[PDB]
Coordinates of C-alpha atoms and ligand atoms in Angstrom, one line a residue:
Chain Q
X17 CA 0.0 0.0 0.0
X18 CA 1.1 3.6 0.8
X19 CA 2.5 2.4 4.2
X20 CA 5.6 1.7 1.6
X21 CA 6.9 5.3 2.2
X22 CA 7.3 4.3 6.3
X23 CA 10.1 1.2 5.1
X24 CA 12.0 4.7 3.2
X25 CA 14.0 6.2 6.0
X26 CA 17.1 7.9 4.5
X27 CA 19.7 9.3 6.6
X28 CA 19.6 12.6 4.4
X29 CA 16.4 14.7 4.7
X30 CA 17.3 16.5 0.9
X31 CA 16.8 12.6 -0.6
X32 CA 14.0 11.8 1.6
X33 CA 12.2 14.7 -0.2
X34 CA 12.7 13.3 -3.7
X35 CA 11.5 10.0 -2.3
X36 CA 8.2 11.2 -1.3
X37 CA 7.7 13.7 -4.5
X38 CA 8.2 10.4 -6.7
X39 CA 6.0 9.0 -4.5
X40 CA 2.9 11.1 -4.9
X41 CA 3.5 11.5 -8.9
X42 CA 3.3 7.7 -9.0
X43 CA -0.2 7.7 -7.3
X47 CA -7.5 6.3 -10.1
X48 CA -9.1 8.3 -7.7
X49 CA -10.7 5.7 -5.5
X50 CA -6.9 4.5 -4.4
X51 CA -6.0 8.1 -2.9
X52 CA -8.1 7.4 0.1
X53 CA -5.2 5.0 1.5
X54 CA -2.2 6.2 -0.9
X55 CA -1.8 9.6 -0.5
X56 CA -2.5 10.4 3.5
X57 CA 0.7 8.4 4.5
X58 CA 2.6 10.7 1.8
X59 CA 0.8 13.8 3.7
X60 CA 2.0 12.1 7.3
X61 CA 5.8 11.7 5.7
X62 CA 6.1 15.3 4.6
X63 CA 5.3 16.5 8.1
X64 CA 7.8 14.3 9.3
X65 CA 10.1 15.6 7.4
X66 CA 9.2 19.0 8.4
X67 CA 10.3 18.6 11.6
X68 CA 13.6 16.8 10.7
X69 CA 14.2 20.3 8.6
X70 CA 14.2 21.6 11.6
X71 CA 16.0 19.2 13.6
X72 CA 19.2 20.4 10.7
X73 CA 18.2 23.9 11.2
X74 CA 22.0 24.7 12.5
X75 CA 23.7 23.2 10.0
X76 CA 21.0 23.4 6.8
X77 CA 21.1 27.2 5.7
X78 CA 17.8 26.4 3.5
X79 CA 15.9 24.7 6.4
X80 CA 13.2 27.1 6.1
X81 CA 12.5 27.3 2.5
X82 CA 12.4 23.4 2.1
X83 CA 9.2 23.7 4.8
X84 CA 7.9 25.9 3.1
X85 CA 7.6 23.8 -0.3
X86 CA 6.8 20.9 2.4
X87 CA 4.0 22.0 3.4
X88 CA 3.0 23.0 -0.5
X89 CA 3.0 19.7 -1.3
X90 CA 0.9 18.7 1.6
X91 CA -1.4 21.1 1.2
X92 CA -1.2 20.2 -2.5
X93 CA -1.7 16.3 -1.3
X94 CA -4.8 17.2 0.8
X95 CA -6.4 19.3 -1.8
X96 CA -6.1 15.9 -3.9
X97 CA -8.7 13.6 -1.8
X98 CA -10.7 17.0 -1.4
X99 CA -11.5 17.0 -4.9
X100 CA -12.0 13.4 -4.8
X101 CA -15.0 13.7 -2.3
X102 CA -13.7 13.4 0.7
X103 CA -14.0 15.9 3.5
X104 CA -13.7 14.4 7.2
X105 CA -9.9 13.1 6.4
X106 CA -9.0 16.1 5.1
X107 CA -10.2 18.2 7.4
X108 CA -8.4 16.3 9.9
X109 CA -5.1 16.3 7.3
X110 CA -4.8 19.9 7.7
X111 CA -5.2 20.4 11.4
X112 CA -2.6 18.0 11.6
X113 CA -0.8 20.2 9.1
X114 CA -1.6 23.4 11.6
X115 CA -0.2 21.6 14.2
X116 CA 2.8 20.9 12.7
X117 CA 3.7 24.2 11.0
X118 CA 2.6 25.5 14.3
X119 CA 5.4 23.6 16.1
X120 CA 8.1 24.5 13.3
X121 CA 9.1 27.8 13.7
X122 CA 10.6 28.6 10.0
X123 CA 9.5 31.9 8.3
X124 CA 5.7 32.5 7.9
X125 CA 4.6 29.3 9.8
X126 CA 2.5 31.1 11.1
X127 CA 0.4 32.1 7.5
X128 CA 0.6 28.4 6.9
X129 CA -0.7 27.2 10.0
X130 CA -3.7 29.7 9.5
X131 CA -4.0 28.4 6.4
X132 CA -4.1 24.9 7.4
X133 CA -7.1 26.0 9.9
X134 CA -9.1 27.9 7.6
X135 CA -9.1 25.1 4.8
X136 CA -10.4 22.9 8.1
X137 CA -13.0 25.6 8.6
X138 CA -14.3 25.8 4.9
X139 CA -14.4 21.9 4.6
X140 CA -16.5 22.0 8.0
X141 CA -19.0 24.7 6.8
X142 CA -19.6 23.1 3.8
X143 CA -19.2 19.6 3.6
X144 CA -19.7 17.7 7.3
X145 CA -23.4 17.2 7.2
X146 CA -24.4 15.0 10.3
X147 CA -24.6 16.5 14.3
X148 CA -22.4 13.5 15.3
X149 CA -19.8 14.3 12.4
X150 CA -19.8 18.1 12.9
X151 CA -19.3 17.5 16.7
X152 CA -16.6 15.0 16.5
X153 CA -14.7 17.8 13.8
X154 CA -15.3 21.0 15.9
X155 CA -14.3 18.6 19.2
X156 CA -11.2 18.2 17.2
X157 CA -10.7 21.7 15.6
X158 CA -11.0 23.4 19.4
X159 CA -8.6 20.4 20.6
X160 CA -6.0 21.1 17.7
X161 CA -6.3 25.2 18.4
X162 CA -6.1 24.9 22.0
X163 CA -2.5 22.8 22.1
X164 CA -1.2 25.9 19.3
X165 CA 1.4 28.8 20.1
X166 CA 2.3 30.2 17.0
X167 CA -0.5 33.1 16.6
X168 CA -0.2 36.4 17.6
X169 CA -3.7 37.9 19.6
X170 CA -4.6 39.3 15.7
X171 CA -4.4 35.8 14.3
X172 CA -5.4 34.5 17.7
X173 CA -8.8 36.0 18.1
X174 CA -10.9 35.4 14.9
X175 CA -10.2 31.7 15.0
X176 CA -11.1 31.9 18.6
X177 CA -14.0 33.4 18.1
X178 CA -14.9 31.3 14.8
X179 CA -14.5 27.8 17.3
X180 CA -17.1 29.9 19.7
X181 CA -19.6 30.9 16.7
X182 CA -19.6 27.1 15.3
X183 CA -20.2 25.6 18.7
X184 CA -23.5 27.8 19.5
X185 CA -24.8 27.4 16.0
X186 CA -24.5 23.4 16.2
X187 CA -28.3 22.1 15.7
X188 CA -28.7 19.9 19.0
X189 CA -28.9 22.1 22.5
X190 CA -26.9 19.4 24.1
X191 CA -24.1 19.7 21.5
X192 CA -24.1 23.0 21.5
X193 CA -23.8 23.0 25.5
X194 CA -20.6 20.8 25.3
X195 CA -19.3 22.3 22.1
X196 CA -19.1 25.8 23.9
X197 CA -18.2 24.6 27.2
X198 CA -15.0 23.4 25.4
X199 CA -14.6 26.4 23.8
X200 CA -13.6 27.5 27.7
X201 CA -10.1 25.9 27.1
X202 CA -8.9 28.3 24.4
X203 CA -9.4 31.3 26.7
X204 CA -7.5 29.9 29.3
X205 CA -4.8 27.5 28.4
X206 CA -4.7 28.7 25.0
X207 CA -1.6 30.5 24.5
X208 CA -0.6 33.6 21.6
X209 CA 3.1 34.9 20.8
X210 CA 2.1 38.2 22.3
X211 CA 1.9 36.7 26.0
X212 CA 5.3 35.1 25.1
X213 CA 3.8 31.8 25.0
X214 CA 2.4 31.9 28.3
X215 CA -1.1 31.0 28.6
X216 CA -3.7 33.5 28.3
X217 CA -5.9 33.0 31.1
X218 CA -8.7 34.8 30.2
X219 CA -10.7 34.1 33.6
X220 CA -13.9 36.0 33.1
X221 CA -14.3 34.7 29.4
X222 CA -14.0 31.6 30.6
X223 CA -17.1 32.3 32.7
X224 CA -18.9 33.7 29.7
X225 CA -18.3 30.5 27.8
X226 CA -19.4 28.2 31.1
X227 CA -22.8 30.7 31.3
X228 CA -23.6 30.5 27.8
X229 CA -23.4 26.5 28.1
X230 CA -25.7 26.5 31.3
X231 CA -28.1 29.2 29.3
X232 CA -28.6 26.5 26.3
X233 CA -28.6 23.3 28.9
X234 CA -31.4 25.4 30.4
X235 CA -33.7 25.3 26.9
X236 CA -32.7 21.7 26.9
X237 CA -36.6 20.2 27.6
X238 CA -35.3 16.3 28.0
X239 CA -34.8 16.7 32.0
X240 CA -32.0 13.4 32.1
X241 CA -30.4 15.6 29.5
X242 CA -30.4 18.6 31.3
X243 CA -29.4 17.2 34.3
X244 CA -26.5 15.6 32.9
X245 CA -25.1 18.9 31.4
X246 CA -25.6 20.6 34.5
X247 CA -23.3 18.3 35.8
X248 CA -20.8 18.2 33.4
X249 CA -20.7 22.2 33.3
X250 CA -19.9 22.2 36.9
X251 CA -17.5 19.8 36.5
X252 CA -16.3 22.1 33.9
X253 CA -16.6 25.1 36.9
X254 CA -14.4 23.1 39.1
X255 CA -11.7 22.3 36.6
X256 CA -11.2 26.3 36.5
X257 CA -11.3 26.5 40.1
X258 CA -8.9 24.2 41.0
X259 CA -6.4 25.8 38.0
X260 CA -7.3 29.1 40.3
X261 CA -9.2 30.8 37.9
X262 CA -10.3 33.4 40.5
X263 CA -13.4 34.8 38.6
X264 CA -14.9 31.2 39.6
X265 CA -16.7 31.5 42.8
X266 CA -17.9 29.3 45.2
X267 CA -21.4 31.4 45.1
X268 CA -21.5 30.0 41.4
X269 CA -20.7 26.7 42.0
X270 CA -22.9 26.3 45.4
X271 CA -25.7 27.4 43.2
X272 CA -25.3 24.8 40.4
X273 CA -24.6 22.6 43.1
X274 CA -28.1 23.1 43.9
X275 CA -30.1 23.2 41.2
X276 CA -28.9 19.7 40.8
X277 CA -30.0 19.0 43.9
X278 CA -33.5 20.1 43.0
X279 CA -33.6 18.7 39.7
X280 CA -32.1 15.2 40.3
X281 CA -35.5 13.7 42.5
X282 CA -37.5 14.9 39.7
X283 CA -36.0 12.3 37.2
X284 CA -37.3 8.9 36.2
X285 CA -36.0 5.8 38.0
X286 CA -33.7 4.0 35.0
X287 CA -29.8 2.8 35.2
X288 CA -29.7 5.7 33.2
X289 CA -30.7 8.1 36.0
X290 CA -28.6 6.1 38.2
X291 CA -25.1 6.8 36.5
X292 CA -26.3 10.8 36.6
X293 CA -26.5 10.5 40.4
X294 CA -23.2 8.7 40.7
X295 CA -21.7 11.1 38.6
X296 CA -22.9 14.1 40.8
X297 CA -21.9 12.0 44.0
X298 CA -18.6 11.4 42.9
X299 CA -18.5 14.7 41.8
X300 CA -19.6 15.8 45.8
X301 CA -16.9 13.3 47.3
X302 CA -14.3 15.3 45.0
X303 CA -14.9 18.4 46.4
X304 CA -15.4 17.0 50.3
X305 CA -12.3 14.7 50.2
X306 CA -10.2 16.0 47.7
Chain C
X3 CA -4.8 -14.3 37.4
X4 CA -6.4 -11.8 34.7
X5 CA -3.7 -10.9 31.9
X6 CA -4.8 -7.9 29.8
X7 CA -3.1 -6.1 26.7
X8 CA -3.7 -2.4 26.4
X9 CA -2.3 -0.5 23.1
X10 CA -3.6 1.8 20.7
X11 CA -1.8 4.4 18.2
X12 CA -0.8 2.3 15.7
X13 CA -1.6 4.8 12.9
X14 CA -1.5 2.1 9.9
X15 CA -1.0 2.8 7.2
X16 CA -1.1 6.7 8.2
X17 CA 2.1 7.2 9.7
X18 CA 3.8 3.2 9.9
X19 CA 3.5 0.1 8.4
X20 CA 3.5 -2.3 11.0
X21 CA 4.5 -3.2 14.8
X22 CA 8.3 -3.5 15.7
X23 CA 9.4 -7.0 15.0
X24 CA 10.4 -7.5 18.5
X25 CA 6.4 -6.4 19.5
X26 CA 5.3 -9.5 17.3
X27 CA 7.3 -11.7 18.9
X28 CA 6.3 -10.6 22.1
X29 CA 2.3 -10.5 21.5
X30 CA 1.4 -14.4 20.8
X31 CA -1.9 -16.1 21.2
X32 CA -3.6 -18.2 23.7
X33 CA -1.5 -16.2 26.3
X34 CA -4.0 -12.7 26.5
X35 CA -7.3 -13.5 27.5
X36 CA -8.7 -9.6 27.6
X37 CA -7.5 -6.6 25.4
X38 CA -8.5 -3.3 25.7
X39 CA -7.4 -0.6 22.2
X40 CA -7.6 3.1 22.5
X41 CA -8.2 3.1 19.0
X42 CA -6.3 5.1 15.6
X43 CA -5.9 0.8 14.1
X44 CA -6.9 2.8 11.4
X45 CA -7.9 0.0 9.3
X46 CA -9.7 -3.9 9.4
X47 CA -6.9 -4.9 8.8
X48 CA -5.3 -4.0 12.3
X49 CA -8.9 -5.1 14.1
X50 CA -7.8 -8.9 12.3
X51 CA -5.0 -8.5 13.9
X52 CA -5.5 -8.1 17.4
X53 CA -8.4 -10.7 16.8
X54 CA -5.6 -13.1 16.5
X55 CA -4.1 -12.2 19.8
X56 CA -7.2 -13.0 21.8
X57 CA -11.3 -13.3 21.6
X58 CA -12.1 -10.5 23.7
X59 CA -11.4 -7.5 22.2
X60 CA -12.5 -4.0 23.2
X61 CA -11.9 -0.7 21.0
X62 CA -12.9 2.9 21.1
X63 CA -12.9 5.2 17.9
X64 CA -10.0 7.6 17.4
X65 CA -9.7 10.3 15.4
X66 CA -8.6 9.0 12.0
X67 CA -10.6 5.0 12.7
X68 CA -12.2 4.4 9.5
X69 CA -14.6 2.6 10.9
X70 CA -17.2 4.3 12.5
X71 CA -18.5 1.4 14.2
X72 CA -16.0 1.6 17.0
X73 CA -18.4 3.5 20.1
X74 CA -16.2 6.5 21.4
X75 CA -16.0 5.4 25.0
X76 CA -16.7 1.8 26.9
X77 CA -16.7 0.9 30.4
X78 CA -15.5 -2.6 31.0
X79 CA -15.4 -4.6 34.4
X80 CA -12.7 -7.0 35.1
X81 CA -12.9 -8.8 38.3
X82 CA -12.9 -5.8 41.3
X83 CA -11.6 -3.2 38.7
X84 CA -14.3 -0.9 36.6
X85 CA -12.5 -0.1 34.0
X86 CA -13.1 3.0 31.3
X87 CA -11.8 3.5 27.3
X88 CA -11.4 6.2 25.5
X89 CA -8.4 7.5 22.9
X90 CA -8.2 10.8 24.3
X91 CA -8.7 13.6 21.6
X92 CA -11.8 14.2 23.4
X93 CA -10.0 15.1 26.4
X94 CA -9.1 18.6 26.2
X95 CA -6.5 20.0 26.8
X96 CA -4.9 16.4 25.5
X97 CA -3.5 14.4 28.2
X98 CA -4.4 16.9 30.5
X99 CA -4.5 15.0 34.1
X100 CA -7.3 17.5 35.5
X101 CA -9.4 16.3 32.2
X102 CA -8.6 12.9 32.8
X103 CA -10.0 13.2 36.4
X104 CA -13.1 14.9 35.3
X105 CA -13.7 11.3 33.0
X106 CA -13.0 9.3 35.7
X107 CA -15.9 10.8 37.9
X108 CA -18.5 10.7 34.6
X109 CA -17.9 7.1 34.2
X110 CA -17.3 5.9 37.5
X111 CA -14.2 4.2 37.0
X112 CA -11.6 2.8 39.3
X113 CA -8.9 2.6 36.3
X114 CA -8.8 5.4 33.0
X115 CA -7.4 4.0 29.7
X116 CA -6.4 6.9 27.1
X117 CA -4.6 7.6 24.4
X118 CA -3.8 10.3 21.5
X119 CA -0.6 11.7 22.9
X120 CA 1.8 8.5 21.9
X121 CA 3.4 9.0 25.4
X122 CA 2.8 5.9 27.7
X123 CA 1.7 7.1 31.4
X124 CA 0.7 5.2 34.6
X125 CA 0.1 7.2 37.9
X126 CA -2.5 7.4 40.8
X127 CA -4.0 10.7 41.5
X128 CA -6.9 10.4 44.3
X129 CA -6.9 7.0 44.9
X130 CA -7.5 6.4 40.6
X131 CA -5.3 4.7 38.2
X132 CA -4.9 6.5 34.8
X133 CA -3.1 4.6 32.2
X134 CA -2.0 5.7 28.7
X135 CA -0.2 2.6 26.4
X136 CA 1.5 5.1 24.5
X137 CA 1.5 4.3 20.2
X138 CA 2.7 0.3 19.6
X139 CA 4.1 1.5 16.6
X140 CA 6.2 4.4 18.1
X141 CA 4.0 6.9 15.5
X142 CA 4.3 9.9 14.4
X143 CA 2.8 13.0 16.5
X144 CA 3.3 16.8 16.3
X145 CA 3.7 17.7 20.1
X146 CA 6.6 14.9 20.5
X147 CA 9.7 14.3 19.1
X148 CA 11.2 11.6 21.0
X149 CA 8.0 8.6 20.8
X150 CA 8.8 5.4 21.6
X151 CA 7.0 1.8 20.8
X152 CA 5.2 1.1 23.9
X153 CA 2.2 -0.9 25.1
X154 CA 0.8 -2.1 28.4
X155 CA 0.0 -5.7 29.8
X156 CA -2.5 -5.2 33.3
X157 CA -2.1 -8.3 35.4
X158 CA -5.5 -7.6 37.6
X159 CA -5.4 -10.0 41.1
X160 CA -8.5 -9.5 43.5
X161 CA -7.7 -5.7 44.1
X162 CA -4.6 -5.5 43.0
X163 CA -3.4 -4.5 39.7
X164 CA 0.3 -4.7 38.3
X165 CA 0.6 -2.6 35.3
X166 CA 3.6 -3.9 33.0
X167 CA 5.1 -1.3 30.8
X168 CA 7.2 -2.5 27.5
X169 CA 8.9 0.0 25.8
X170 CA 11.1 -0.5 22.5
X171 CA 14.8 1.3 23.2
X172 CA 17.3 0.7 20.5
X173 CA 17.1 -2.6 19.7
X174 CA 16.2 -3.6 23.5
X175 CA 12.9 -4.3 25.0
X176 CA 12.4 -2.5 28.2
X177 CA 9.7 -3.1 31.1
X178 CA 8.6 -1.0 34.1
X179 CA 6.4 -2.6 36.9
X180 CA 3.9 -0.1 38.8
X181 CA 1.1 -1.2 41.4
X182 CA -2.3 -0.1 42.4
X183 CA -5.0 -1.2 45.0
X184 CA -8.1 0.0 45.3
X185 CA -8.7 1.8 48.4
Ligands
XFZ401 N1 -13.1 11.4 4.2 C1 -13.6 10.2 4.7 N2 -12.8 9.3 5.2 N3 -15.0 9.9 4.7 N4 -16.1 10.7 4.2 C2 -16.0 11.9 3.6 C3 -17.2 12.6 3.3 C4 -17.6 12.9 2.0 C5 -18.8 13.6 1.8 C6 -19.6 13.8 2.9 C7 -19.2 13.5 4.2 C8 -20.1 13.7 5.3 N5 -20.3 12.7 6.1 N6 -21.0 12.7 7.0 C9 -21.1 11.6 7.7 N7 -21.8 11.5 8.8 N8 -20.4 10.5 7.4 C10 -18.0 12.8 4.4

């Protein structure tokens, strides 16, 4: 198969480039969904071994640039072969990478990277489970990122936060915002020097938001359940001494649950919500 | 008493071709009864394998699993130990221990299996066991430079469990021994 390319390991990363370029010019369309993301893995790799030769390769920078042309080049392929949910993937991965790589304008590829995630989301991932799974993954890809300044920083923030709330399910929506809550906190730009932004108050925003939409939520197991994963959520932020978390806030969800939790029907169901929210209460009693 | 194999990662065809020879020697049937996958196979082809290995096989989806047939989490009890499965890319921030614990407390779990970071881990943190196999096939992964083969082998006895930790280093299989009992 494709997994050919992983046996071709040479010592020199200029030859290794030729490898994987003859590679992808000897690969029907139907093939390309096994042939070509193995190539798209081994130019990454790559990458990074560009890198690894930065003090002794004067060109290291330019040859990861063309390296992740051809990937992008690569992904575009299975694109236009009617594919979407690996290639979305492909280029987060390819974000990530650039990302970590810190030749000249990584950071315009690794946006890149993310936006062609973006467009393929938007218009191509059709079903609530599939769209949650890839925003689950495009927050989780963002959040472990360093490479953006605020200006780059902000409108792919704010993009993750706009696709979460406009998901069709309430419940995905509640989840899908309440992990937005990550990328205001241990998200991290170049401005802060790489330190994390911890954006406290935002953070609450996020967690309200998510307990305003588990409130229009009419199946009460469902609701419950979010509530509980939310303050879970709360507590995670506490403990990481996010100071705009209160125990007033937490008390009070604490409650509600309390209220809410009688009211359920009697099902195993109902029973794993309860041990959840005990084991949630021991937490905080016994740390 | 109970032998169980725990892996994941192995990212074929993606980013490797196959398990280190000195894996496949290791991993031989009729000697693991119980195996639990964090998932990322990505193929049948891998699922056949591990069917060889033993009956009872357990897998969770990861994020490039073709088939969509794996469910994204599982609870499993063996013996005393309630045991839960998930790769990980769910978990955010990835391999985040705080995360982890937040699972743990959802699925009311005495032991945590992940994945996703291709780092193997094994600690107690409030009287819980969280245990990550690391990739089998040392793949690929952004975040980590240095990945190295690794799987796990739980030998669970009463309320005990000794966690076995093989690790590919050169040419030179490794192994680690940690213990936990449940409180
Ligand atoms: N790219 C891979 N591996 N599989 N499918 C791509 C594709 C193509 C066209 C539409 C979609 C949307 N799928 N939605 C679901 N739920 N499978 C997905």
């Amino acid at each position: 198969v494709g997994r050919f390319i992983h046996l071709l390991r040479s010592e020199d990363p200029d030859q290794q480039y030729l490898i994987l370029n003859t590679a992808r010019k000897h690969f029907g369309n139907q093939r390309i969904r096994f042939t070509l993301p193995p190539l798209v893995f081994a130019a990454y790799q790559l990458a990074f071994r560009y890198k690894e030769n930065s003090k002794v390769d004067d060109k290291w920078e330019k040859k990861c640039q063309k390296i992740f042309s051809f990937a992008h080049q690569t992904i575009s392929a299975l694109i236009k072969a009617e594919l979407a949910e690996l290639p979305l993937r492909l280029f987060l991965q390819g974000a990530l990478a650039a990302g970590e790589i810190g030749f000249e304008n990584h950071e315009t590829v690794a946006y890149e990277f993310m936006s062609q995630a973006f467009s393929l989301y938007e218009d191509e991932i059709s079903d609530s489970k599939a769209q949650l799974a890839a925003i689950t993954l495009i927050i989780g890809t963002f959040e472990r990122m360093k490479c953006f300044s605020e200006e780059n920083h902000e409108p792919l923030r704010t993009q993750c936060a706009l696709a979460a709330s406009k998901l069709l399910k309430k419940p995905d929506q509640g989840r899908a915002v309440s992990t937005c809550a990550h990328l205001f906190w241990s998200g991290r730009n170049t401005d802060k020097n790489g330190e994390e932004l911890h954006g406290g108050k935002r953070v609450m925003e996020c967690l309200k938001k998510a307990l305003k939409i588990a409130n229009q939520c009419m199946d009460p197991s469902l609701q419950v359940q979010l509530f509980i994963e939310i303050l879970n959520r709360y507590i995670y932020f506490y403990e990481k001494e996010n100071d705009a978390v209160t125990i007033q806030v937490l008390n009070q969800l604490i409650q509600k649950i309390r209220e809410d939790l009688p009211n359920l029907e009697s099902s195993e169901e109902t029973e794993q919500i309860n041990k959840h929210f005990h084991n949630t209460l021991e937490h905080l009693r016994l740390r | 008493h109970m032998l169980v194999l725990v892996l994941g990662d192995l990212h074929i065809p993606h980013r490797c071709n196959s398990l280190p020879a000195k894996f496949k020697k290791l991993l031989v049937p009729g000697k693991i009864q119980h195996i639990l996958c964090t998932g990322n196979l990505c193929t049948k082809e891998s699922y056949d394998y591990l069917k060889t290995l033993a009956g009872d096989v357990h897998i969770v989806r990861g994020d490039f699993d073709e088939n969509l047939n794996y469910p994204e989490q599982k609870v499993v009890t063996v013996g005393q130990f309630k045991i839960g499965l998930i790769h990980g890319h769910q978990v955010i921030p990835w391999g985040d221990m705080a995360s982890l614990a937040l699972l743990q407390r959802q699925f009311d779990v005495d032991i945590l299996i992940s994945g996703h970071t291709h780092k193997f881990e094994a600690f107690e943190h409030e009287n819980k066991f969280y245990i990550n196999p690391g990739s089998a096939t040392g793949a690929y992964n952004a975040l980590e430079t240095n990945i190295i083969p690794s799987f796990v082998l739980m030998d669970i006895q009463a309320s005990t469990v000794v966690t076995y930790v093989y690790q590919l280093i050169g040419d030179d299989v490794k192994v680690e021994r940690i213990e936990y009992k449940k409180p």
